[model samples]
Target: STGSATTTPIDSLDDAYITPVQIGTPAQTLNLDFDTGSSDLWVFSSETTASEVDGQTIYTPSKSTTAKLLSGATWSISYGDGSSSSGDVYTDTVSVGGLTVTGQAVESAKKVSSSFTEDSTIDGLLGLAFSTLNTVSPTQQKTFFDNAKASLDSPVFTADLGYHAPGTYNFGFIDTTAYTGSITYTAVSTKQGFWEWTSTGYAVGSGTFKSTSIDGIADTGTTLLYLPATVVSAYWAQVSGAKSSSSVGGYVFPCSATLPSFTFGVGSARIVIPGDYIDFGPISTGSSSCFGGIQSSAGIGINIFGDVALKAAFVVFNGATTPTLGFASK
Candidate 1:
């Protein structure tokens, strides 16, 4: 059997996508962000303070008859961007699409950062990364995907993130019709609990492709594409009037600037990001400055191919032995 869900862009920011998930006995539906960058299924709950809970929906475990507390168990998670949440644990029934998993550990948030409080649409996060990255102390918890993989027809999921459009995430099976041509697969190194892979090279615009090996992770939670500083500088050079702005904290250019296309090599396949997509809209409302979707990953060791890059292709997160990534044109 297969489980699939439609993901919709949150606002026009396109920073992250949200999917509906049902939790508890009677089924309390909540909108959750399926994040590939982190491992922890956490949600705003009755445990959260009234002041901390914003416009988001809170999960109430007491309402579920099947809810069981994992005494002394707690979880704390912080993202690379500084967003964080921490809470106690409850074992309950969790379901996505038509797939259901019983006795899954659900971390109910008692505390959340301003980032989460400010964004009210996201009630929680469903981590798709390996279970080893789970933040629960004393004993780690497994993700819904990991817990349900055994019953799935195929232990794989495909991410079909779209640009300003509705996309679908398919679990337990792949929808071949969702992509064009053949998928080019690359071996993944999951030692870090991320879908980490190396790119053979990258080219800015139509310029010569540079053979610079880049280690990176495919992250749906992240909004922008981050590469090495040198590579970022090179890409910006092609755009006239483009400069690193202290106010913007990244490369910003005139909104009218004709951006260059970016292409990254995976094995023998070249995944291309269109020029228009590189210009990630205006820096501010009514402002002439626009932010470059591609930026520098100076301090971070691994480059991040975030939603900005992933939306351009059909990605398969293969969980079979020695996990691999399969990419193809959408």
Candidate 2:
């Protein structure tokens, strides 16, 4: 069966996209971040200490007759940005859009780091990454997508993330109406538990498309696009008054500066990021400077084509046979 759900930006900050998901017998609804960078379906729950959960909605498993505690099991995860959480495990029915999966492992937080506790809008993370990356102890659990794949009309999902607007995540079927032009396909290597691929090269503005082999993942959860330090430096170099500011982190440029468009290569296909998308909005409060949406991956060890890059196109996460990514202009 095919199902679709709408995803909305958190506060127009363009930080993350959140979607509604139902858990347990009575369907406790929660707004969860659909993250492709990690594998874990975790939520703030009754198991979490009162102090650890701030204004976020907690899933009360005791109220669900279908909930079953998976005793002796636990899960803990730390994000790249340092947000972390650990919790106990429960097996329950989870539904997203029109699809439902029985006995899905749902991690309920027992403790949450300040990063999560401070973010009141997001109640949990619905991981869309490979099952190989799931962190549940005793026995790693399958993601909602993985558990539901076998019953789907097609083992695929499409992410149409937007800029300060509503987008959609469609499961089991592709919606041709969501995109235009031919969808360029690229082979993906999930050996690292990500939909990682290599873009042939990139270019700044109207400059020549540099043929540099760039490896990165298509991560919807991450807010900005991250590349190698060298690549990032080169892009910002074209922007007048752009500098790497220690105080603000990454490259910040004059708010009025005319930014250049950035483009990435996917084989013969080129995905161009508009100039407006390059400037990730203002840096800080009352500041006349703005942060570059494209930053250096550096210590992260791998490049990430985050929301800034993905929103420019319609992306298909193909799970049938070998995992591949299909991109087209929206």
Candidate 3:
């Protein structure tokens, strides 16, 4: 079985990639962020505090006849910026694209933090990481991808994240037409619960390729690309007048500065991120300084190949017994 769905960037910075998902008997469609870094398929729901609903869609479990209470099963998750959500569980019919999963564990939100409340574009998250990372207590639940993988023609899914446009998420098989070249596969480390992989190295525009192993996760949920301070600094050094600012929270430079394209290696293949994509956006609407799409992951403790990097290539999240990740140019 194979299916496909579309994902769109929510705003100017491409902060979060949102995909359409449906739940319950007739299907209550909501826009969800398909997060490969986390493993709980939680959503804003009827049980959510009314005060926290701020323009976001809520999944109404009560309205779905197929929705059954997973009595006593609850889940809670805390995110990078202190944002959080917790809720009881429900088993219901859920579908993404045209693929359906019956009696799938659905975590319904009972409470949400203000940070999620303000990010009005997203309704919730659909986790694709390993099931061992699931947060549910008592009996842990599997991710949508985990439950659905049994039926897929091939136990794999792919992400085609677009820069400023709509992209496709395919289940089961790879769409040969979506990419331009042969797919380059790499061993993925799921021990940490993320689709983690190591890049052979990177190069700044026409500069010599730096032969170093950079370990990071391919996280579509995260907005920007993050790397070691040394590599980030080296990249910024090439751009005149770029500097780190505690006030702005990251490296920024004059909007006029000519940003160089960045290329990272996967096995023997190199994926190039365009200069325009690296110019994330201005710090403010009319500001002269622009924040870089690539930043130091030093503070975060782990590097991240987020949307800024994923958007530059076609990504395959293989879910075989021994999973492997693949990347290729589009």
What lDDT is obtained when candidate 3 is compared to the true structure? 0.92
* Per-residue alpha-carbon lDDT of candidate 2 for residues 1-330, written as tens digits (9 for 90 to 100): 877999999876688889999999888999999998899999999988898788988899999999999999999999999889998999999998989999999999999999888899999999999999999998999999999999999999999998779899999998999988889999999999999999989999999989989999999989999999989999999988999988887889999998898999888888888888777778887789988899999989999999989999999999988999998987
TM-score per candidate, chains pooled? 0.97, 0.98, 0.98
**Clashing residue pairs found in predicted model 3:** none
**Tens digit per residue, CA lDDT, model 1, 1-330:** 689999999877587899999999899999999988888989999999788898999899999998999888999998988888998999999999888999899999999999999998999999999999999988899999999998989999889998888899889998989998889999899999999999888999999998878999999889899999989999999998999997888999999888889999888888899987677778889999998999999887789999988988999999997799988998
* Winner of 1 and 3 under lDDT: 3
Sliding window of 10 residues with minimal summed lDDT for model 3: 78-87
Which residues of candidate 1, in runs, are more than 4 Å off?
none
Error of 3 at 183 (Å): 0.3
- In terms of TM-score, how similar is model 3 to the real structure? 0.98
Alpha-carbon shift of residue 252 in model 3 (angstroms): 0.9
For model 3 the local lDDT of residue 16 reads 84
**Full ranking by TM-score:** 3, 2, 1
Instruction: Name every residue pair that clashes in candidate 1.
Output: none
